[PDB]
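#help-structures
NK: newbie question, is this the right format to request a structure? protein is Carbonic anhydrase 1
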Amino acid sequence: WGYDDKNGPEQWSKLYPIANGNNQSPVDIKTSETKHDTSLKPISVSYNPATAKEIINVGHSFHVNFEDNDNRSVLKGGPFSDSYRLFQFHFHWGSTNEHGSEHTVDGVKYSAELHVAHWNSAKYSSLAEAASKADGLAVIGVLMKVGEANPKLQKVLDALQAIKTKGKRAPFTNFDPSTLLPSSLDFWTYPGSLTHPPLYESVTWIICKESISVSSEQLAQFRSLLSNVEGDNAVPMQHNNRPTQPLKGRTVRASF
Ligand SMILES: [Zn+2]
């Protein structure tokens, strides 16, 4: 599978039938249809920079992984009763500044999106077990609006030159991803899924109301990563965002 015309999102249903499920992500958040909930508590994140471990080029994107053997880095509050353990963060982008984000707000598309993923360590023993459970994963999504350069993305961007081609990986340590989140943590939440195969409907999404910035040049750095293996003709990672999917009766709740 991929994001190309032949094996792209529109064709994923052939190999992964759940792509046409009733809890698929991303979605378009229509603010006039969101339901306020006083039951929702503020989001609380506490990450230990010592848990940062490695950065990897996976062909269609790049991931920054964290050690998840204990609860040194966790997410709590919001619609959760259990604490979720941080395990990875990555981004999605488009071919030009005009698109790139996965989620949209009132039909508006942004240039990129940051995803910070966690798994339920209170109920499960590992990521593999939790990934298929309805309450197994929690992902924070932050919309990235093109504008001024974001200095907080510096360490991440400077690391790409060491993992330019598919399969390359390198140590990525002493980093706290909470520094990438917006100043305000007001959010929207809804029951969804992984945005790429296997597309499991096991994700409770936390979408931030406030966006963070990114410059046109920083976006160019994401797009310059290569999807081919070392030695082959270079093929830039042009885009990796999935189109929004039908809400199918789900309700998006707002913490504000
Ligand atoms: Zn993602």
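mod (FA): yep, format's fine, and the tokens are attached above. The helical segments are 127-130, 154-159, 216-223.
NK: thank you!
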